[PDB]
Design a protein around this nucleic acid. Structure first.
Ligand SMILES: [Cl-]
Ligand SMILES: [Mg+2]
Ligand SMILES: [Mg+2]
Ligand SMILES: [Mg+2]
Ligand SMILES: [Mg+2]
Ligand SMILES: [Mg+2]
Ligand SMILES: [Mg+2]
Ligand SMILES: [Mg+2]
Ligand SMILES: [Mg+2]
Ligand SMILES: [Mg+2]
Ligand SMILES: [Mg+2]
Ligand SMILES: [Mg+2]
Ligand SMILES: [Mg+2]
Ligand SMILES: [Mg+2]
Ligand SMILES: [Zn+2]
Lengths: 188, 50, 136
RNA sequence: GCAGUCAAGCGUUCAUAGCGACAUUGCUUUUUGAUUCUUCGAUGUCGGCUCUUCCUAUCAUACCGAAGCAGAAUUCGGUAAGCGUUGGAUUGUUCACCCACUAAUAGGGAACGUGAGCUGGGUUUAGACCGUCGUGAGACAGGUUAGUUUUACCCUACUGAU
RNA sequence: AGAACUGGCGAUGCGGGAUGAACCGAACGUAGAGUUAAGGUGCCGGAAUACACGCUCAUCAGACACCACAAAAGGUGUUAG
């Protein structure tokens, strides 16, 4: 109904510096630097002090206000990404055919290889996005760990691994074979 | 593997189905996301295996 | 050829369209075979299905034992009068057209074949090769 | 002819996997009627053959969702007309009915596409036969047999050529 | 297809509805000036890309009587009650 004013608060810890100009957000922390372009929302940022940043929408409708809270979450994820990081844990689920997963190098592209999924002869490869590191945890059976500063890069990279192992022409209720995200958390 | 079977069932079995366009939906959804059926609220749970 | 064939066959010039009558080279009691269809044939307007050496056809016995007549049965062509080219560059042909009565799996109804048998047919159908005396 | 809404019930339990009574809202012009506006100083009339293109209410092929989807097979639905959709016996047939191959043998439109493109078996001139009807001449959307298919050199369109 | 009252077309141009026998405006000797009707003023096109308060975003939006079509039933789309 064209609300006069809507505000959201963004906190920053001691070790994180945030520079915003012309809707360009650069977050620098102990773990690195993240950047984001937000020239599609029409909001205004202001600085209250060294530990608080406000974002506001003036004379906005229901749909415009709904995107204001999205900005706060996106900026907050950048802040905690450069401080705590993100960790996604995935498990291998199979009934008969073991799933073999290894990191391979192909023309300097840092791929990950999936072999013998449901006995398939086809070789499955998923590119590893920049800034994402992949480790195979010990003392845990069939677990792969993805880490990075960007939550979107880590989450989407893990999503690619789930989609590449979809069963076709079978009852997926019975054939529950694949790799699935089992835990979302932080590096620290 | 009861622990791993539950994890896989969360993505393959714990879903809702639209009664008009058969779209696969979150279990707690109230309306279908598809524009083809006009975001209808007529939904049913996904049938369990046997 | 249908089911029961061992391997594939290089293309051979067709010389036996539907309606052709070929000799029966086995000892099942039939004297000729009247081809009504060709297994694995394609579709084209006005084009007659045609068979060559080694093809499996559907045939009816016109002359022979009474119990073999008035019915449809599969058959395999073993000789061809139409000339065809082999991949070694040789054009060759037989004196007559001949076939043998078989089942859908390719097993022969009879147990003996008179006259020569083409090499392509023998390799495709193991049962024909067993009952054949001279290949080519 | 095709498609919705409602849900008493069918479905071992279980309205809506797949179906669905009693009612009710539409769409289509590939059926047949209703009408009589155009044409009787004439728009060549059934079917087939040949050839091009269009529609999607999709038979097959590509990728998917759903199931009372273990596998195999099948069923319901979505995006999709890009690409295919046949060979024969009987009948003038459209239609129909069988045999067979096939990934499949989906449904339609274009003056019920297409006769100065063909063909002329049917219908629908004059000859002739039969049955029933009529005193009779003759009648029969009943059966049967024989019966002339004309013209492009003009304009445009199209295909090639200066 | 067939009646009732009135107004029209037929017998009638002119401005408007892109286009149209019947609708809207208005009925006609030859000319000049001024003002209007119905309908219009982004460009085609003469005339404000005027003013004011709201509503709507459609991967088939909508756009002006006669008139060149759309319904039952639905949507935590958005708005008001
Ligand atoms: Cl009479
Ligand atoms: Mg004339
Ligand atoms: Mg003409
Ligand atoms: Mg004429
Ligand atoms: Mg016609
Ligand atoms: Mg003619
Ligand atoms: Mg013509
Ligand atoms: Mg003509
Ligand atoms: Mg005739
Ligand atoms: Mg006559
Ligand atoms: Mg009248
Ligand atoms: Mg008059
Ligand atoms: Mg108009
Ligand atoms: Mg102007
Ligand atoms: Zn839906």
């Amino acid at each position: 109904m064209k609300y006069i004013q809507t505000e959201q608060q963004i906190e920053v810890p001691e070790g994180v510096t945030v520079s915003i100009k012309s809707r360009i957000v650069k977050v620098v922390g102990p773990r690195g630097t993240l950047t984001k372009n937000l020239k599609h929302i029409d909001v205004t940022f202001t600085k209250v002090n060294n530990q608080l940043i406000k974002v506001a929408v003036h004379n906005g409708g229901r749909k415009h206000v709904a995107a204001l809270r999205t900005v706060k979450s996106l900026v907050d994820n950048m802040i905690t990404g450069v401080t705590k990081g993100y960790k996604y844990k995935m498990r291998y689920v199979y009934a008969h055919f073991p799933i073999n997963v290894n990191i391979v190098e192909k023309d300097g592209a840092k791929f990950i290889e999936v072999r013998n999924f449901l006995g398939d002869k086809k070789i499955r490869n998923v590119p590893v996005r920049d800034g994402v590191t992949i480790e195979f945890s010990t003392n845990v059976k069939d677990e792969i760990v993805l880490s990075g500063n960007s939550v979107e890069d880590v989450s989407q990279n893990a999503a690619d691994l789930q989609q590449i192992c979809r069963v076709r022409n079978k009852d997926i209720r019975k054939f529950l074979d694949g790799i699935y995200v089992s835990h979302k958390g932080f590096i620290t | 593997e009861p622990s791993l079977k539950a994890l896989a069932s969360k993505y393959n079995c714990d879903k809702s189905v639209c009664r008009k366009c058969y779209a696969r939906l979150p279990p707690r959804a109230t309306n279908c996301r598809k524009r083809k059926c006009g975001h209808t609220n007529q939904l049913r749970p996904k049938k369990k295996l046997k | 050829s249908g089911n029961g064939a061992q391997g594939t066959k290089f293309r051979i010039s067709l010389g036996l369209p539907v309606g052709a009558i070929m000799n029966c080279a086995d000892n099942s009691g039939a004297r000729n075979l009247y081809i009504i269809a060709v297994k694995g044939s394609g579709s084209r307007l006005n084009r007659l299905p045609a068979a060559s050496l080694g093809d499996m056809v559907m045939a009816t016995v016109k002359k022979g034992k009474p119990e073999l007549r008035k019915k449809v049965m599969p058959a395999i062509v073993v000789r061809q009068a139409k000339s065809w080219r082999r991949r070694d560059g040789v054009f060759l042909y037989f004196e007559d057209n001949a076939g043998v009565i078989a089942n859908p799996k390719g097993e022969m109804k009879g147990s003996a074949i008179t006259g020569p048998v083409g090499k392509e047919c023998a390799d495709l159908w193991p049962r024909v090769a067993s009952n054949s005396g001279v290949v080519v």
